[PDB]
Amino acid sequence: AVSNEEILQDPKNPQQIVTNGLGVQGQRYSPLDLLNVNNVKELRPVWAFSFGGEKQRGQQAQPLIKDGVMYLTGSYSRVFAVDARTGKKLWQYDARLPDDIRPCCDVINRGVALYGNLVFFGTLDAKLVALNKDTGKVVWSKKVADHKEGYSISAAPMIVNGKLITGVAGGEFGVVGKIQAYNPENGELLWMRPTVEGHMGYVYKDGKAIENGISGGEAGKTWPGDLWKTGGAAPWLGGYYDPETNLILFGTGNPAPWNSHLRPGDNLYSSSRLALNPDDGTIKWHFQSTPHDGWDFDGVNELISFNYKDGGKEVKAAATADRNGFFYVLDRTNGKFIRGFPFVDKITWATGLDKDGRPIYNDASRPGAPGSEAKGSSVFVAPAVLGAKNWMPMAYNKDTGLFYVPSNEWGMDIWNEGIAYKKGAAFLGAGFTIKPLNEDYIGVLRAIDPVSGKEVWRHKNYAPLWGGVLTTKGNLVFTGTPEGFLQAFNAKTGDKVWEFQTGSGVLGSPVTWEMDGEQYVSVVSGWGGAVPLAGGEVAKRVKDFNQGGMLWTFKLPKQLQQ
Ligand SMILES: O=C(O)c1cc(C(=O)O)c2c(n1)C(=O)C(=O)c1cc(C(=O)O)[nH]c1-2
Ligand SMILES: [Ca+2]
Ligand SMILES: [Pr+3]
C-alpha cells in the first residue's frame, strides 16, 4: 500500500517514513518538532529487538515505517518486519547465501525499499528480492549479476517513477559497475546502464535487450587496453532522486585495480557523481571527484539536493562530502562545479581544485610503480583509503541551512605492487597502513555551511565515526558512535544534549516519526563495517568494542513534551 505519490510526499506525513533518506532527495531532515533541545533529556528506550542467529558484524540499515510496521535489514542479507509500538516480530526472511559471497568490507546491508504491497532488498550474492509485506514470503527474485565474479549488493534500493532501481558492489574485485531498473510488481528488467566507459547500456522490451548507447561514447577514451573490462566504478551506495530536474543522482566507486600505474587516464566514470534519466537509464551529466584515482577514493558518497538564493537568483544545488576530503557543491541541473573546499584538516594528494572542480594534484602523494622490485616505495597520504567520509550519510537541516557530516581524520602509508586479474579474486595491487593524525580522536562530526564554505562547529570522537546522521526541526542532530552511543547535539552549536549506551557500536542512520501523538526515534546497532579490517593503530583503538545486532526504539512521552 505504498504509492509513488506517497514516496514523493516524504517527509511531510508525520506517521511514516517510506524512503531511505526521509525524502527522495536524501536530506535526512524531519519536520517533527515535538522533541527538541529543551525536552530531549526525557527521551528514553521503549523496546528493543534482537536480530539473533549468531550472525552479528555490521548493521547499517535505516528502518522504514508504514502502517505502524518497521521494515529493516540485518547483516548476512536478512529482512525483519517489526511492530513499531511493541517491538514484536511480524516476520523475518533469511536469504540462503552461498559460501563464496565476495563482499569487500563486511556483510552489511543498508535497508529496504517499499512499493505497493512489497518489500525489496538486495542480497550479498547480488540478487534483488521482493517479499510480501504481510507474510515475508518471496514474491520474486532476480539475479542482478554473477556473485562468482565478485559482485554483491550492500545498498538500499530506491523507487523512482514506479521503477525499482539498484546498483551493485565489487570494485575491489574488478567488477563492471552498473545501475539497473526493474518493474517492482514482477521483477522484469527495464534498463541497464554501465558506469565504466566502453560498455553498452540497454533498454528491454518484450524480454529482448535493445542497445541504448555505450557509456562514455566509446571504449578506450580514458582507459588503456582492455583495462575497462574490469574497471570497477561500482555504484555501491545507491543514490537519491530530485523531482525538480527528474534526475537520479548516483555516485560511483573507485577504478580498479588500486595500482593506478596499470590504468593511465581519467578512468571514467569511476569516482564520479552521475545524473541519470529514470525513463531509460541514460547518463545526462557527470562530475568526477577523483580522476585517475590512486587511493581507493570511491566517489559514491551521497549527492544531496538543496536550494538556496544567490544574488536574488535561485540556485538548484547539490552537495557531497567526498572520500577524498573535499566538500563539493554542484549545480544539479547540469553537473557544473559551484564550489569545493576541504572538510578535514589535512589533505596531501591535491593542493586545491581548479575552476572546473578538477584536482590540482601533488604527485609526491601518489605511490610509485614497483618497477624492478616486488613493491614500490610507500608514500604518506591523507585522507586514508577509508576516506574523510565513507558510506555513512550526512544530513541537511533546512532551518540552519547546514550539512552535518560524520568525518574522520587519518592518513596512511600506501604502496603499489603488480596485480593480474583473476575472476573472483581480489584485484588490488596496493597495500596500506592507516595512521591516525591525532592521538586522542579520529571521528569529527562537523557542521558545514555549503553557501559560505565554512565550518560552523565540530565535535570530536575517540573512535572513528561510522554512522549516518539525522537532523530535525527541533534543533537536533543525531548520530551513533562505535563506543555504542546514540548521541544528540544542538544543531546550532554542536553541544551534546543527550546520549544512550546501546551496548554495541551504532552505524545505522537514525529515523524519527510520530505515532499516537508521540515522537519516536529509532536506530540499528551492531559494530562492523570496514574499520575492524584495519590493522595497526586503528585496531588498537577499537579493540574493546563488541559486536551486536539490535533495533532500538526510543520515545518522548506525551506528558513530558511541554
Ligand atoms: O568499490 C566497491 O565496490 C566498494 C564497496 C563497498 C560496499 O559495497 O560496501 C565498500 C567499498 N568499496 C570501500 O571502498 C569501502 O571503504 C567500504 C567501506 C564499507 C563499509 O560498509 O564499512 N563498505 C565499503
Ligand atoms: Ca521514468
Ligand atoms: Pr572501493
Rounded Cα gap, residues 423 and 256, in angstroms: 13
Three cell numbers written together for 339: 564550489
The finding on whether 151 has its CB within 6 A of some atom of ligand 1 is no
Spell out the long-range contacts of 281-284 with Cβ–Cβ below 8 A and sequence spacing 24 or more.
Answer: 281/179, 281/180, 281/181, 281/191, 281/192, 281/193, 281/201, 281/203, 281/212, 282/193, 282/201, 282/212, 282/213, 283/193, 283/215, 284/247
How would you class 351 by CB atoms within 10 Å of its CB: exposed for 0-12, middle for 13-18, buried for 19 or more?
exposed
The three-state DSSP-derived secondary structure of 350-398 is: EEEECCCCCEEECHHHCCCCCCCCCECCCEEECCCCCCCCCCCCCEEEC
DSSP assignments along 33-46, one per residue: -SS-TTTGGG-EEE
**Cβ atoms within 10 A of the Cβ of 225, count?**
11
Strand order of the sheet with strand 89-94? Answer: 64-66, 69-74, 78-83, 89-94
Q: Any catalytic annotation for residue 296? A: yes
How would you class 378 by CB atoms within 10 Å of its CB: exposed for 0-12, middle for 13-18, buried for 19 or more?
middle
Rounded Cα gap, residues 529 and 545, in angstroms: 13
> Which residues have CB under 8 Å from 311's CB, separation 6+?
none
CA separation (Å) from 335 to 24, 161, 179, 340? 19, 22, 19, 13
Rounded Cα gap, residues 11 and 408, in angstroms: 29
Distance of CA 200 to the CA centre of its chain: 26
Pairing between β-strand 283-288 and β-strand 113-115 as defined by DSSP bridges: unpaired
Quick one: resolution in A? 1.7
What's the 284 CA to ligand 2 centre distance in angstroms? 14
DSSP state, residue 343: S
Please give the single-letter amino acid code of residue 276. L
Q: What region, left, alpha or beta, does residue 400 occupy, with left being phi > 0 and alpha being psi -120 to 50 degrees?
A: alpha
> Which residues have CB under 8 Å from 47's CB, separation 6+?
86, 87, 553
The answer to whether the CB of 239 falls within 8 A of the CB of 250 is: yes
The finding on whether 530 has its CB within 6 A of some atom of ligand 1 is yes
- The one catalytic residue in 10, 296, 363, 399 is 296
Nearest residue (CA) to ligand 1, atom 5: 169
Q: How many CA atoms, within 13 angstroms, populate the side-chain half-sphere of residue 532? A: 17
What's the 319 CA to ligand 3 centre distance in angstroms? 21
Q: How many CA atoms, within 13 angstroms, populate the side-chain half-sphere of residue 430? A: 27
How would you class 55 by CB atoms within 10 Å of its CB: exposed for 0-12, middle for 13-18, buried for 19 or more?
middle
Question: What's the helix, strand, coil split of the chain in %, to 5?
Answer: 5, 40, 50
- Look-up of cell digits 565478485: 150
The finding on whether 294 has its CB within 6 A of some atom of ligand 1 is no
CATH of the domain at 460: 2.140.10.10
DSSP state, residue 116: B
What's the 492 CA to ligand 3 centre distance in angstroms? 34
The answer to whether the CB of 285 falls within 8 A of the CB of 268 is: no
**Cβ atoms within 10 A of the Cβ of 86, count?**
12
What's the 378 CA to ligand 3 centre distance in angstroms? 20
CA angle 53, 57, 131 (to 5 degrees): 60
How would you class 187 by CB atoms within 10 Å of its CB: exposed for 0-12, middle for 13-18, buried for 19 or more?
middle
- Look-up of cell digits 558512535: 481
Among candidate residues 285, 354, 288, 279, the one with its CA nearest the CA of residue 316: 285
CA separation (Å) from 408 to 293, 390, 456, 458, 497? 20, 9, 17, 12, 22
- Collapsing DSSP to helix, strand or coil, 537 comes out as helix
Method: X-ray
Q: Considering only CA atoms, give the Rg of the chain.
A: 22
The finding on whether 296 has its CB within 6 A of some atom of ligand 1 is yes
- Collapsing DSSP to helix, strand or coil, 315 comes out as strand
Q: How many CA atoms, within 13 angstroms, populate the side-chain half-sphere of residue 107? A: 18
CA terminus-to-terminus distance, the chain? 35
Distance of CA 12 to the CA centre of its chain: 23
Among candidate residues 313, 309, 263, 318, the one with its CA nearest the CA of residue 289: 318
Please indicate if the annotation marks 254 as binding a ligand. Answer: yes
Three cell numbers written together for 377: 616505495
DSSP state, residue 536: H
Domain range for 466 is 1-562
Nearest residue (CA) to ligand 1, atom 8: 169
- Collapsing DSSP to helix, strand or coil, 232 comes out as strand
What's the 131 CA to ligand 3 centre distance in angstroms? 29
Count of domains forming the chain: 1
The finding on whether 171 has its CB within 6 A of some atom of ligand 1 is yes
Please give the single-letter amino acid code of residue 413. D
Among candidate residues 416, 432, 341, the one with its CA nearest the CA of residue 380: 432
Rounded Cα gap, residues 524 and 236, in angstroms: 20
Query: For a pocket test of ligand 1, which of 298, 300, 509 has the largest count of ligand atoms closer than 8 A to its C-beta?
Result: 298
Judged by its nearest atom, the ligand closest to the C-alpha of residue 165 is 2
Please indicate if the annotation marks 171 as binding a ligand. Answer: yes
Please indicate if the annotation marks 296 as binding a ligand. Answer: yes
Among candidate residues 458, 465, 487, the one with its CA nearest the CA of residue 406: 465
Rounded Cα gap, residues 369 and 418, in angstroms: 8
Please give the single-letter amino acid code of residue 345. D
Atom of ligand 1 nearest to the CA of 385: 16
Beta bridge partners of residue 528, listed in sequence order: none
Please indicate if the annotation marks 170 as binding a ligand. Answer: yes
Rounded Cα gap, residues 279 and 283, in angstroms: 11
Pairing between β-strand 127-132 and β-strand 138-143 as defined by DSSP bridges: antiparallel
CA separation (Å) from 376 to 56, 413, 415? 37, 12, 6
Nearest residue (CA) to ligand 1, atom 20: 529
CA separation (Å) from 345 to 337, 376, 455, 482? 22, 28, 11, 22
DSSP state, residue 417: B
